[PDB]
Design a binder for this molecule. Sequence first.
Ligand SMILES: *C(=O)/C=C\c1ccc(O)cc1
Length: 125
Amino acid sequence: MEHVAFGSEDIENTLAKMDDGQLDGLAFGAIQLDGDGNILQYNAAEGDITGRDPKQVIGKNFFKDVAPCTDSPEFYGKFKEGVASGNLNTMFEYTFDYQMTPTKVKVHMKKALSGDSYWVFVKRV
Ligand SMILES: *C(=O)/C=C\c1ccc(O)cc1
């Protein structure tokens, strides 16, 4: 298993060296989005939590198609502000409840070391 802890201060650096294969070895959910909320990466742990198949949601827009419970001021609003500002680093609990059993998770959104990409990290609480 890849050894990186959820909430690590230098996680964006560690994950920059990871392909889809290594991202799947994380102990927590990991989603990479572009500026518009499109899914570039989606790991196995994220799939075990959300139920959806990794390979089928890549390409999809996270806020419009895949995950609406997130289209609101407390998740999407925070993400859109971060994108426009060029800086993003926030952590909060939330509840995923679309087409699945209501699940409490802890989310960490952070701008990737890369240009126009952003990370969404999920774990159970
Ligand atoms: C609330 O809906 C949050 C996240 C989420 C992620 C994946 C799927 O499939 C549903 C919901």
